[PDB]
Symmetry: D2
Subunit: 331 residues, 4 copies
Amino acid sequence: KIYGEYLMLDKLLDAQCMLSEEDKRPVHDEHLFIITHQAYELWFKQIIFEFDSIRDMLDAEVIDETKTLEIVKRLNRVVLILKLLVDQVPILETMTPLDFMDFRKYLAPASGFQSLQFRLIENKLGVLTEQREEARNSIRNSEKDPSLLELVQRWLERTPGLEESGFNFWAKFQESVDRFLEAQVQSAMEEPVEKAKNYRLMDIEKRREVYRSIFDPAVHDALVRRGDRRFSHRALQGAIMITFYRDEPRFSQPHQLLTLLMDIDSLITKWRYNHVIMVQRMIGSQQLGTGGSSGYQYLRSTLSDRYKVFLDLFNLSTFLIPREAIPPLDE
Amino acid sequence: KIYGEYLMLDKLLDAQCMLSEEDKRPVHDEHLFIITHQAYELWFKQIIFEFDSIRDMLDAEVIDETKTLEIVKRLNRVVLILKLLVDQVPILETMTPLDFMDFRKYLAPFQSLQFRLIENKLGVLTEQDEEARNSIRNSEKDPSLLELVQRWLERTPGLEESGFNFWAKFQESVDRFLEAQVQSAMEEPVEKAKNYRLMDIEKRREVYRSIFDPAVHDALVRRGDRRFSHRALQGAIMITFYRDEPRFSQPHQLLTLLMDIDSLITKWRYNHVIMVQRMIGSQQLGTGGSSGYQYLRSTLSDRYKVFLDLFNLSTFLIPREAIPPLDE
Amino acid sequence: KIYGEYLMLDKLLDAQCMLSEEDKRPVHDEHLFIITHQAYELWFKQIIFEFDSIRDMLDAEVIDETKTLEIVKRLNRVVLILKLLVDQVPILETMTPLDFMDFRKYLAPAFQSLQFRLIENKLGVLTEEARNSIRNSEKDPSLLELVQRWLERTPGLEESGFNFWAKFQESVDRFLEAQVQSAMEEPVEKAKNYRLMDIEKRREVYRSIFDPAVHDALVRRGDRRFSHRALQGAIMITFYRDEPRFSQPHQLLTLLMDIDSLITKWRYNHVIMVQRMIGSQQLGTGGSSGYQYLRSTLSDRYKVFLDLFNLSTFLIPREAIPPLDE
Amino acid sequence: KIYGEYLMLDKLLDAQCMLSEEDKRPVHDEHLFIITHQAYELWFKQIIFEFDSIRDMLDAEVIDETKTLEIVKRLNRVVLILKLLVDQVPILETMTPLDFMDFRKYLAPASGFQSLQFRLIENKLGVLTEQRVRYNQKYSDVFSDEEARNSIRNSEKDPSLLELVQRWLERTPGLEESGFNFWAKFQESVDRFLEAQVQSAMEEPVEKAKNYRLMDIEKRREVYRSIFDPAVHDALVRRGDRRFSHRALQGAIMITFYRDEPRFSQPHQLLTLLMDIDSLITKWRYNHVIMVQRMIGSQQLGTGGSSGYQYLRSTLSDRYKVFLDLFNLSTFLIPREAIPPLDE
Ligand code: HEM
Ligand code: HEM
Ligand code: HEM
Ligand code: HEM
Ligand SMILES: O[C@H](C[C@H]1c2ccccc2-c2cncn21)C1CCCCC1
Ligand SMILES: O[C@H](C[C@H]1c2ccccc2-c2cncn21)C1CCCCC1
Ligand SMILES: O[C@H](C[C@H]1c2ccccc2-c2cncn21)C1CCCCC1
Ligand SMILES: O[C@H](C[C@H]1c2ccccc2-c2cncn21)C1CCCCC1
């Protein structure tokens, strides 16, 4: 009912135990170390709570405009929380390496993941397991149950406009590309400067390779096997269609949903980068007790594209054609 | 020892109880409401922990350069935490007023014990559960940062009459400077510009009278316009004059950070009152009128700023050439 | 065509003239003073360009969903620029008061900025080419006026159609009647009395919007700015913000409040910087009138969309809100 | 004297020319594109002005506490400007790719570097530039005039902040053999510390823990060999793994060891701000490449392939970080009790 009881502050504010104080050698900054991590864990619980509710709203055949608005609200809220978590790094960087060295003896390393909740966030978003008892159950369920990556793909596959009997976007798009590149060739052929004519013709050939990568499903499949793409061919067609008509009321919220998924992915990378810089400022690439630089090198490897979930969304503008060449909406 | 046990996550992650879920009318955003407030409370505990350690380092006759550097580090850390707490407001503003309305029935009407402890430990004026009562009493009786900073400022080397005797040299330089301004204003060809400069010199005379006459300073303190003792104000003025000097750079950074903290608390108060109005307007069903909203608006006044004196210091400044040069 | 020519850098990067350097007494921080102000003026030109395009899109009888989306994009863009301009204040605060004192003799007293005044007038703040710009910004419709005209044409308010306002008064009457009966059966006498006094406060709140004479009196007094019908439209939008048809109109109102709030945050940060630099008064200021004027700009008399900030005062729970028909 | 004349607004506010408006096909967002870039260029001029003044204060034999404080103020000011410049990227991301596509035809690619001032900042800090030189539709000059070529040449030949900071670090009081003689006391403390670790590891009851600690002490030995053997340090500098001279690194290490001491607190803050500047430039590069990809993907019509996007991604490597040596300093740290106590 009242503030302190409602928020269970007697339990929350009783979870801070400084081991350097227990051992009669107190390091003042150990309190900061505990609070910073606990604030991260409170916000990780919030992100998991948001992610699970979004996963449940996406696990349905019909996703209406009303539910789409609520998914956008929750994804945007996760973006704000992640921005706040990135800003928590300079607060811990205020602790000197020598002060950290005076209490790191009371800390034990991890045999698997560092944080249970951080791993649950990674798995629920769609971070690849191959591209790397209640707690074991949580990890198993996060690996077996559909991730946001998979659920977003199912939603994109059912994008209205892709059906052959209806708007038939994909065929109209290949048709428009052919006419657009034909017009570019004719315009390039009339270039008075020979150098500019040759450059434009080579550039039109680069566009042809780009369109082959999406219009030939076998080329798309090879990129998925290679790890360059993750989306199914139909999820990519839906995602491309959404970027083309983002100005249209019917596609603005679906587009904002995709934009926010990219923002979340990008903010997780920014957290990883800020964390690895803080780690290096505290203990360098290796220190006494670390057994070499394997911990630091592992953190650096998490900065690769193998860890980005919605890599496909970042490249969508490669396939764009100008407004005048885009197939006009019928309905 | 390991992560989860060291951070006591079994206790920390078991303090979130949604009352709308318990009553089987769940409001999804109630979880955000709990987590946002709990993150504030964790950082309030950190600020109190920092403030108590700074208060202890300041409760000493000698405050050396090494301890000054550590106080500056901890005050700067509090500034970073306050900036993060101001940024937590837009996250809660993401909850709609209608969603909040669906769970506010489970909430009952100081608001936060730790927030009040921060106010008292910093020096927010009282005139302007047994463990909780004890904490409030100790925060009111024990010296606040406002009082301890004043004691530190009073012992500023350079103020003593036997040594550098800054205050007397400063009154002497002001007289010399204002005399030169008068002579320059007397040679102004345009009568209107001469009269403007002469009226302006007269306003400077009143400004300096407010600090060079201790009775005028005392009256301003009684009125609530100033908080500092006359000697703490002399020390603070001296520090701003020589901030570029190595000897005064860290004492100046200490004052700057106290102002930053004061300013950030006001920014939190403003962002909180805007969020409150976005959620329930000036009054709503269950508020009993607009008294709560009006109280929050009154916390935005200068009566709630602790180091009001520090913000006005530049009013007393004279140019570099007129400042008494350091001897030693 | 190429970068430097396209951006006219030969002209842009030749507009920094340090007067302390010209007089052979250089103050290094004078360069920062010039660049900071010039960055503000570049962004003020961008905000005016955005505001003028939004004013033109709002000066139309029909404002469809497609145009509403574009207005939201530009308003959100202005919010991001204002946040950036608030962050430019600590950069200038890095200059010391003594360094500023060494070059402020080359500065003249003076509105301060033409573009800042144009932004205030184009938004709707109630305070020869430059004089013409000021006159046109005062005579031509401000965003405050154009948003009111848009709110007045909110679909749902017409008596022949959805008739929101009448259904809303009807729902309020039934809701407050139910609250009275519930309060009458409160077992604790203290809680019964508190709830009854609280319902009376709600009655006064609803009288302020359901009686047009009470609304008109609040507008004359300065407590409100909106016409009665603009306020009905704004209230309706906040009630149905979860509905796809009202989400973008609501986001438009939200962004107007954000802009208003960010201008106040800039004013507050500017007045703190001013006090850090020259206190409440200094040599050349002729007293504290300049500082007191800046402090008065922090009042609600300077907020344009004050009406939008109070809208949640009129809210009733989801179950009591008239359901959408169409 | 008055606002508009002092700031030369008649000249400043007359530099915005939308080419889509000139061609009678106006794209509203083209105005944003011009202003954003012009705000970057104004702040680049400010950073260059700050960097040149810091370079001049560092190009002296004696750098006193008063000047050290002023250098710290200007480096900190640059950090605030860089943070503001990173925040300018989301403002331009507000322009849709299709709107950008409607005016990119009026833009020409560039012969060499994109911005003269951004290159001057890189060179003045100490960035080691790669190679580039790309084929374009129509050729253009790398330098607009001999004054721009001269600026680039002077920024490459004249001492960068990287070089001047090294000279300052080389003269760190405490390194001289006749005085505090830090380096010898430090090697001596490391020898005793590692000897104590060996004896403690030898008494480990569990064999697995004993072998882990002994293998870990061997890794520490290699770490200390990389700084106590000048030939190993020299090899790392030739390889590109380090940039600092051996004596500059000794001074930087000494400063991190005694950062709590008043005499070393401002020299340490100076190093910290150099790392912050380096880190913020990388953050700008990352945010810029994400915006580029959101606008035109990895390649688009007019780009001639993905070489431009791949070049920008290559600027995110450690080869572009200037003060890489400063980021690793904590690798060499020993506990407080093992650090040689200050004498004087
Ligand atoms: C003094 C500051 C810190 C130090 C020295 C530090 C150190 C490290 C190291 C060495 C690792 C790699 C372990 C290994 O696999 O060998 C790691 C991983 C990790 N740390 Fe930190 N850390 C610090 C602060 C933080 C904070 C504030 C958080 C926030 C919750 C955090 C969360 C994590 C997580 C979640 C991982 C796993 C990363 C992944 O698997 O991709 N650390 N940390
Ligand atoms: C849904 C959002 C919120 C609403 C509606 C709200 C509402 C209110 C109201 C009405 C009061 C005044 C009570 C009275 O004296 O009559 C108040 C005070 C207060 N609230 Fe909130 N609040 C919200 C979020 C927060 C958050 C996120 C915090 C952070 C800890 C917070 C901390 C406080 C504190 C510390 C006070 C006391 C202020 C002072 O005495 O100066 N509130 N709030
Ligand atoms: C060293 C820093 C600054 C000082 C000392 C300063 C001082 C002042 C003073 C004293 C006034 C009031 C003049 C009067 O009416 O008597 C004023 C107004 C104003 N200043 Fe500043 N200022 C500073 C920086 C800035 C910056 C960075 C900007 C950005 C463009 C700015 C923009 C303005 C504007 C637009 C007004 C008019 C405010 C209004 O009418 O509401 N100032 N300033
Ligand atoms: C619509 C947004 C933008 C697009 C599409 C874009 C695109 C590009 C591309 C393709 C390159 C590489 C050129 C090549 O070497 O082949 C580049 C480089 C560069 N751009 Fe942008 N850019 C954008 C905005 C900006 C902004 C806002 C700035 C700020 C001044 C900027 C500054 C630069 C600089 C300095 C480089 C050179 C980077 C380096 O050499 O490391 N760009 N940009
Ligand atoms: O202000 C209090 C609620 C109180 C509170 C209770 C539980 C958790 C957090 C908070 C809170 C935060 N700020 C004020 N309050 C009001 C909020 C409006 C409805 C009646 C109770
Ligand atoms: O394993 C801990 C780090 C671990 C940790 C333990 C306890 C509480 C928090 C954390 C933490 C946060 N990020 C990594 N870790 C070691 C990792 C090697 C350097 C010294 C700390
Ligand atoms: O009137 C000027 C301030 C004015 C100004 C002049 C020239 C360039 C920029 C500015 C400025 C910015 N904000 C207020 N002003 C003040 C600045 C010092 C104290 C009394 C005169
Ligand atoms: O190389 C220029 C982009 C270059 C540029 C030119 C003119 C003005 C600004 C800019 C700019 C900003 N960042 C990169 N560039 C090309 C790159 C994409 C196709 C058409 C513009």
